Amino acid sequence: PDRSFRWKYHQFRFLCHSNALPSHVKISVSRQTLFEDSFQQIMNMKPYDLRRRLYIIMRGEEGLDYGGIAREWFFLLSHEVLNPMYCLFEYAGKNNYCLQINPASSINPDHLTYFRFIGRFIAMALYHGKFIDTGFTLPFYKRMLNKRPTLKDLESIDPEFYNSIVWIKENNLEECGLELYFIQDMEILGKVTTHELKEGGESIRVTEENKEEYIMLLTDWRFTRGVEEQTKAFLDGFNEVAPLEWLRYFDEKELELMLCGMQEIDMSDWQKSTIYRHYTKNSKQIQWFWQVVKEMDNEKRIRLLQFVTGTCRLPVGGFAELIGSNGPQKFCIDKVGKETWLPRSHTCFNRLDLPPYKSYEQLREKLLYAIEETE
Template sequence: MGNFWMCTLLAPFYKHILGVKVTYHDIEAVDPDYYKNLKWMLENDISELPDLTFSMDADEEKLILYEKNEVSDYELKPGGRNIRVTEETKHEYVDLVAEHRLSTAIRPQINSFLQGFNELISRDLISIFNDKELELLISGLPEIDVIDLKANTEYTGYTSASTVINWFWEVVKSFSKEDMARFLQFVTGTSKVPLEGFKALQGISGPQRLQIHKAYGAPERLPSAHTCFNQLDLPEYSSKEQLEDRLMLAIHEASEGFGFG
């Protein structure tokens, strides 16, 4: 279970502590490729996928449980292996997959943790927080060295000399301690800073420095993030003020799905 908790404790597990329902967006922290498949399903016509049913096969179950023993197919709802997923029911399918992968399949482990946690801290005391705020409450506001972060950032579509990138770092350097923590949460999924500094920042597959990619499309769109790749998709804004406005809005308001609609 080690790999699961390493990534999912950053968002879905804080939701479990608060009793908040997980969504398919949270799957990105566990399996980015699977998340992309689900996202593709929601954005495209799946009428040509006749073999997709409301069930998960044994191989998927083993991946979820991180065990090598044989398991049977799992039905996402009664009779699910005989119910085809259609264009009309695909949202239900995605919701059920998220609930199973992030909750049902690991329910005994979740319950064991929550039993101990709730003996120490009543849910009533933390119910006023969202999952991001709860992480900051439990972990505290980190000391973030912006110079170190900048030195360990890589660019795609931009360079370190790009005007937008210069604006970006000027804006980030002006952040309060709380907004810096929110920014780090937004891009990496956690406010924690590696003990060795940002050169040791981890992604889902190992060491992964902060990535800033040029986002194409409407210039007024919000920045978005791929947390398990520590990747920020940053549009080419027309002014520093616009960049600051869009980035602040993203880190404060677009936490659900980390900027994905």
């Protein structure tokens, strides 16, 4: 819970080792048919047999040490499931920003079995201590941990909808005549439907005395709308291989690290590709900021990268190629707020709202706290 990431990791490993089966299973794939072979063979196994040693066979190749052939199969299949012909996923923003399940996935008639498969595969990666690069979002990880997505999470997947809900939260809708009811619409595959946000929501108007419950239910609906069955199929497939309850103690950032591996952060590249707003590279707080970063070990730097961008993954080009929800967006630090505030981030824009703190000590303390405790 409050224990270190490394401690939680070893507890999880002990659960995995304590429940391993002997012998092995063979997965034989060809590279041209990676997904189809991987899908047929894995879905034709009893799920507990996937806890045995994995013998991955690239049909017609080398062999030797399995750590590297394991990593290549896990890596490549984690990209192949994104293949648009399968119709399983889509992206919230431009240029493959913010992966999410495609609500129209049922156009693939097998799509629930495909999601169950991806669940098994992701559990296999965790179980066998191997890493993937699919790009699931921090709220997708929250669901696996039975953490409710927050209002702040919305800003990562849907900046406008977030701003829209923030506006309602902060403003008197009765004063502006805003007409809202506890219902929402959704069109998928050209078939628009209506979901009541609670019983009788159709007629229940949103008032100042209603607002907080409305915001909550609307938030829940944005994250689950149209992807319920897909998400359940993913979760049941994962759970079949590795019980989801073994993932206790992790927060969603740690789970992302568990699945992605650990990125070494180049402080040089980071600093050469940061842009400022109101601040400049010579501002006192910006200098204090980079001194805090230099003082951080690599785990804290990753934690900060996740806090500001919403992910531990850097693009292959480094910090220069960093993408936001509306195109390329470099890491940005902006002078916003009071020194009584904590730093805040807008992950869709890779932006850190750094208040003009008066001392290195104050900035360092609030920054380390925010990274550890807030999102």
